[PDB]
Amino acid sequence: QEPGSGIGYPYDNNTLPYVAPGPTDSRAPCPALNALANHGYIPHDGRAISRETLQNAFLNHMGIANSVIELALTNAFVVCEYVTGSDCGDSLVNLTLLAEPHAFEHDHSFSRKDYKQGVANSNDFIDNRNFDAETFQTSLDVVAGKTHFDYADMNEIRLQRESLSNELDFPGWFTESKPIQNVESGFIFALVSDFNLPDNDENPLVRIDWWKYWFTNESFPYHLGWHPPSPAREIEFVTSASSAVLAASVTSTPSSLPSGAIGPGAEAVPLSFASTMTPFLLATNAPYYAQDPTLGPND
Ligand code: HEM
Numbered sequence: 001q002e003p004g005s006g007i008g009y010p011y012d013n014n015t016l017p018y019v020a021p022g023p024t025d026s027r028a029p030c031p032a033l034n035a036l037a038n039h040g041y042i043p044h045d046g047r048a049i050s051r052e053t054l055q056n057a058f059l060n061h062m063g064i065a066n067s068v069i070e071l072a073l074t075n076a077f078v079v080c081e082y083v084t085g086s087d088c089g090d091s092l093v094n095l096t097l098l099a100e101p102h103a104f105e106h107d108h109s110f111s112r113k114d115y116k117q118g119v120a121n122s123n124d125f126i127d128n129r130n131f132d133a134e135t136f137q138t139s140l141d142v143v144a145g146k147t148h149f150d151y152a153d154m155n156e157i158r159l160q161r162e163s164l165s166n167e168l169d170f171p172g173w174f175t176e177s178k179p180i181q182n183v184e185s186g187f188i189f190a191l192v193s194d195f196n197l198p199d200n201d202e203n204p205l206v207r208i209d210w211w212k213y214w215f216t217n218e219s220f221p222y223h224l225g226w227h228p229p230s231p232a233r234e235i236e237f238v239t240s241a242s243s244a245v246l247a248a249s250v251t252s253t254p255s256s257l258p259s260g261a262i263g264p265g266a267e268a269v270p271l272s273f274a275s276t277m278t279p280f281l282l283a284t285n286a287p288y289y290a291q292d293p294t295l296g297p298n299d
Pocket residue numbers: 029030031032033054058064068069072073076098099104105106107108109110111112184185187188190191
């Protein structure tokens with residue numbers, strides 16, 4: 001928000017306004033990075049981004065501690081070298097390359113289509129990077145008519161997304177990604193669980209309106225009473241939530257689930273790519289911005 005607005009106070013005392021991305025700006029498949037970039041907490045153009053710039057932006061503007069993004073930083077830079085063909089040092093070339101498929105970006109996302117979702121021909125691909133309202137609605141509708149949801153509900157959401165993606169993706173494309181997805185499950189509990197409930201730290205429940213605002217708008221739901229978690233969330237909370245989602249009892253089983261979908265997931269680890277392997281072409285679509293309605297500087 002505009003610095004003088006005090007909308008962030010006393011949790012964030014140095015805010016900057018929302019500015020929609022223009023056609024030449026680089027955006028990510030990540031709703032967190034996109035929100036940060038839209039506020040200029042990382043470069044508005046989404047290019048040439050250092051580890052410290054990312055650390056500071058998450059910590060000071062989102063209540064996300066350095067521990068939370070340690071692996072994510074490692075993996076961003078692995079993907080940068082893989083896509084560009086050379087070491088990216090400490091300047092992430094852009095946000096867009098993070099949408100390189102079957103890498104950090106993965107299938108059965110909550111709010112993005114898959115790289116080969118519903119393509120008629122094997123060589124074709126689609127926008128697996130920009131926010132997709134229809135896809136996100138498939139996640140939201142698992143919890144239709146509710147204001148909050150728990151770990152068991154999140155397990156049901158990711159299962160619905162896995163089922164839909166396994167059915168709709170070009171045959172042979174679909175690749176299950178429980179470890180990366182469920183760290184992201186943890187990230188959702190970390191950012192938008194309801195801190196106004198007395199047991200939030202131990203038994204977090206996601207506030208659906210906050211989740212929807214964040215993903216749809218790629219900005220922060222201050223108008224709905226949200227603020228950055230204080231103190232900043234740490235990695236332990238995230239991986240615990242990840243475990244809990246995958247351990248939760250499944251009461252409604254979708255068909256067309258991949259083998260081993262139900263049950264615990266592997267620890268997320270650093271990515272690696274064969275030097276021989278050429279990267280998949282990146283979707284070239286202009287960056288998405290909210291248009292129904294468009295956002296003002298304080299939104
Ligand atoms: C340097 C730090 C980060 C990097 C490089 C990064 C990168 C990515 C990438 C490449 C994806 C796409 C995965 C996919 O859904 O196919 C993604 C998704 C996602 N990110 Fe991040 N991320 C970072 C930090 C965070 C943080 C701190 C949060 C929240 C606290 C967050 C929230 C999410 C969520 C919820 C998704 C899933 C979106 C969906 O499934 O529709 N990210 N991120």
